[PDB]
């Protein structure tokens, strides 16, 4: 990983020592990025609904993971499940129950710094994985990117600044997530996110991440060329909003 400080340094250490999970995979891979493109042509807003119990920024809600997912399944383009244990209260067991219950694409959200985590995602039933440019060096990113493709997955590469985008573009990323929240300081900056969305090649599927709570926000981001939206907090607090985001 890269030189890190604070909580990013801690969570990355927890991940280096994360035990692998052994299990048989039932269903074949369902591509999340190809499905976002088909929602685009059908002119249906593509929302990736996220399940997370806790968050360092203050979220804290109790809600059944299976019911929430079966519900989101009627409208969402895919699901994003947190598997990080200490800060998000996630677990590999939750991803597993979810994958056996629905049949739409699943993104595994964690801090992936080593190949065994991708084996974990595959064996658990996830369809793709998230790779964060700011915590990895260029070589590590390039290696983790190839490893995931060897399983037929196109991972979601997350950027937060221009330096991250230079790197993602160089290694040939085709599915990018622009995150408005800075992992290190927890600050949200919608402006910096808009500048970045505008610098991205039009042939890569773009996903806007963090701080979205209103439908006007989604409408604005869409005309800006964004293909999909990853929404966690607002949907966890009020599952019902999915109906408003979708009209
Ligand atoms: O989600 C958080 O609360 C959080 C807090 C500190 C550091 C990273 C975090 N998450 C980053 C992230 O990618 C989020 O899980 C999703 O993009 C959705 O953000 P949300 O919709 O909840 O604002």
HEC per residue, the chain: CCCCCHHHHHHHHHHHCCCCCCCCCCCCCCCHHHHHHHHHHCCCCEEEEEECCECCCCCECCCCHHHHHHHHCCCCCEEEEECCCCCCCCCHHHHHHHHHHCCCCEEEECCCCCHHHHHHHHHHCCCEEEEEHHHCCHHHHHHHHHHHHCCCCCCEEEECCHHHHHHHHHCCCCEEEEECECCCCCCECHHHHHHHHCCCCCCCEEEEECCCCCHHHHHHHHHCCCCEEEECHHHHHCHHHHHHHHC
Nearest atom of ligand 1 to the alpha carbon of 50: 18
What burial class does residue 181 get, using C-beta atoms within 10 Å of its C-beta: 0-12 exposed, 13-18 middle, 19+ buried?
middle
Technique used by the depositors: X-ray
Query: In whole angstroms, how large is the CA radius of gyration of the chain?
Result: 17
Overall size of the chain counted in residues: 247
Distance of CA 35 to the CA centre of its chain: 15
What is the topology classification, in CATH, of domain 1-247?
TIM Barrel (3.20.20)
For residue 30, report the distance from its CA to the centre of ligand 1, in Å.
24
Q: Which of 210, 221, 230, 231 to mutate to test the pocket of ligand 1 (most atoms within 8 A of CB)?
A: 210
Rounded Cα gap, residues 85 and 226, in angstroms: 30
CB atoms within 10 A of CB 4: 16
Whether the CB-CB separation of 132 and 103 falls below 8 Å is answered with no
Which residue has the least CA distance to atom 1 on ligand 1? 55
Residue numbers annotated as active site: 50, 52, 109, 158, 179, 209-210
- Report the residue numbers after which the chain has a gap, meaning the C atom sits over 2.5 angstroms from the next written residue's N, or none: none
Q: Which of 181, 212, 239 to mutate to test the pocket of ligand 1 (most atoms within 8 A of CB)?
A: 181
Report the DSSP pairing between strands 46-51 and 128-132.
Answer: unpaired
Q: Which of 51, 209, 221 to mutate to test the pocket of ligand 1 (most atoms within 8 A of CB)?
A: 209
CA angle 122, 204, 144 (to 5 degrees): 35
Nearest atom of ligand 1 to the alpha carbon of 213: 21
Ligand 1 pocket list (CB less than 6 A): 50, 55-57, 59, 179, 181, 183, 186, 209-211, 230-233
Rounded Cα gap, residues 190 and 11, in angstroms: 25
Nearest atom of ligand 1 to the alpha carbon of 183: 7
For residue 126, report the distance from its CA to the centre of ligand 1, in Å.
19
Whether the CB-CB separation of 2 and 134 falls below 8 Å is answered with yes
For residue 209, report the distance from its CA to the centre of ligand 1, in Å.
8
For residue 56, report the distance from its CA to the centre of ligand 1, in Å.
9
């Amino acid at each position: 990983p890269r030189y890190l400080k604070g909580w990013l340094k801690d969570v990355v250490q927890l991940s280096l020592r994360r035990p692998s999970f052994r299990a048989s995979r039932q269903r074949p891979i369902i591509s999340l990025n190809e499905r976002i493109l088909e929602f685009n042509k059908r002119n249906i807003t593509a929302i990736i609904a996220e399940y997370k119990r806790k968050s360092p920024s203050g979220l804290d809600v109790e809600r059944d993971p299976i019911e929430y997912s079966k519900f989101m399944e009627r409208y969402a383009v895919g699901l994003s499940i947190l598997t990080e244990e200490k800060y998000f209260n996630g677990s590999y067991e939750t991803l597993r129950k979810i994958a056996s219950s629905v049949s739409i694409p699943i993104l595994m959200k964690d801090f992936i710094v080593k190949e065994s985590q991708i084996d974990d995602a595959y064996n658990l039933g996830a369809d793709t994985v998230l790779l964060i440019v700011k915590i990895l060096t260029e070589r590590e990113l390039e290696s983790l990117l190839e490893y995931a493709r060897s399983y037929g997955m196109e991972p979601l590469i997350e950027i937060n600044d221009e330096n991250d985008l230079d790197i993602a573009l160089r290694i040939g990323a085709r599915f990018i997530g622009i995150n408005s929240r800075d992992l290190e300081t927890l600050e949200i900056n919608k402006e910096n996110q808009r500048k970045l969305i505008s610098m991205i090649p039009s042939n890569v599927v773009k996903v806007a991440e963090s701080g979205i709570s209103e439908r006007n926000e989604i409408e604005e981001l869409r005309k800006l060329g964004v293909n999909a939206f990853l929404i966690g907090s607002s949907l966890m607090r009020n599952p019902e909003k999915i109906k408003e985001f979708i009209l």
